[PDB]
Amino acid sequence: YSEARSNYDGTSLPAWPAPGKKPTYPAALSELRLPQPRMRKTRTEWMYYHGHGGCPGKYGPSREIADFEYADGTPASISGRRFAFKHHQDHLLVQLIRAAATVERYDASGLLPRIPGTAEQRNWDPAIPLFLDDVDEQGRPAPLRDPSAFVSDTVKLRDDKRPYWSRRRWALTDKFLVPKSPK
Amino acid sequence: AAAIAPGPYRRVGNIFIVHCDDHPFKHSWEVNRMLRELRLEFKGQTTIVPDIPQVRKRIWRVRHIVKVDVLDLDEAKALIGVPEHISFTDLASQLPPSFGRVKAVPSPVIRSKMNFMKLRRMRLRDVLHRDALELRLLELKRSAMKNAEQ
Amino acid sequence: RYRLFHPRREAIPMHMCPAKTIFPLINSNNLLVKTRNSWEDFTGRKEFDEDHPLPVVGSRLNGRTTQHKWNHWDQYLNPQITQSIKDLTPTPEYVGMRCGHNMIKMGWMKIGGSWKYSRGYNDRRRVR
Amino acid sequence: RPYVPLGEVAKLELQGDYYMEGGMFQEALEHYGVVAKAYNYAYPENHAQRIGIRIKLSAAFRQTGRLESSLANIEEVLRMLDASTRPSLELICEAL
Amino acid sequence: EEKFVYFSPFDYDRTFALVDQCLERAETIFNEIGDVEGAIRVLQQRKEMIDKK
């Protein structure tokens, strides 16, 4: 008759709550590590969320489901594009399984390092720690028996102006300066 | 219980899902070579690659194009219904080499003769089948004539 | 926004295809592998039933096709059908007359094509 | 013809001979059982896909040790191929 | 590989595959029972089938 599936099994979460309880809602915030922008999810992000690609015409229920049955329930036939799509869809799986296999025989052979990142990343980025073994990272060992105190970040929003409403402070605040455009 | 987990301990690696968010023709040929090694052609393509060091060496250079996600292999075993007692090595050992775009061969001519040899092995399969049948029939006729004369 | 933040886990949704597709019985214990392993190896559309035949409507690989001229194999099997002189076509390696221009440094160009690159060609044509 | 969701049962059937090809016969047997009930209801007498799937069903019975059941089924397949207008040349070959 | 394109008969007609392994099974049975003439008959028919194809 009609087909609605989100899954290969056809299963789902319990889409409706018990009567008289509170519903579970999706996080509407775009998923970003930084808390400050706080930006609502785009339509495209909602389509990524609901198990499509970015577009209605890929990877969703809108592909996998046949456009038509017959009246008696006899289904459709396999298009060249349908078969090609099945090949792609299994190409992803083959890709994943081969990647995982490579990781597994790499840590079987023991080539997965205990030091995160490559050498290029190490000498680019002062985040990754120095992995020095038997020495202290910063000179010799610190004694065992606050940078912001002297560092000033105070952003001055409005620039302080020159007191023309007072005669003495006008001339005492004099700036002896000559405007020069670069030659 | 405020204690270290009792081991046998297993080591589980990671897997990078890589997505290309920028046009490669905007960028130099070295960045493009790196994107090629990551199996990315155009804007909008997504690939799955291993967490081994070489791959990170590649992803680090193109990081201003590629956006990355990580899945450790327990999570990869979860993402697809895969019984946990089944590893990925056996699963890889099962799937056929004959999968599309099987190898990285150095120039298109070699690619062409790779496919050509793929067809050649088919022809030789059927020919060897028929020829084997002719062989066995020949032996049956030989034994028959020998047992008949004697 | 064109800068989208979301895990790229969803660029490749696996919800639709589990390993039950590529490994037919994986929830059992045998790991059979059924993969349709190219886009090339598609055999074709075929009917589900006798009752509902597949319609006949042509493509350009069908509808535009000329009548069959006898090649050299068909006249070898059955000499009965060599009936007239037009069947006497020569060795198939003969393509026809030279139909175009070999223009230096750009390809084989077409008669009635772009002559912009013909300078070298024209000058070569009139002849430590 | 009466409505039966043939898409679903077909999916069920190919899962069936994946089971049979995969080296476990009992389960292919029950699968074919379900699907053959479906085709038995959905199609008229002596239809091609009906006798087809009970060819497969005879094949499934035969592998599990129910031999006589397989024999009975395949003879019924024969006498259904008998009463068919123009059966498939592939089906009679596979059957026998 | 456009000039060398090959399509195996064990694909495009399943009938041929069926009769082929049919005769293979028959020939095995003939080997077990000890019929020489039968086995020769079967392999001849099979050969003729394959080169007919």
Binding site: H88 | G44, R101 | W39 | - | -
Partner: peptide
């Protein structure tokens, strides 16, 4: 250039893809 077929690729239209009819037993037999 060489194709990786990383993205989705539709198949080609090729003559092996013809819908080949099933052989039928004759009517009288």
């Amino acid at each position: 250039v060489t194709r990786l077929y990383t993205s989705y690729y539709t198949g080609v239209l090729y003559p092996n893809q013809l819908v080949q009819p099933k052989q039928r037993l004759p009517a009288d037999v």
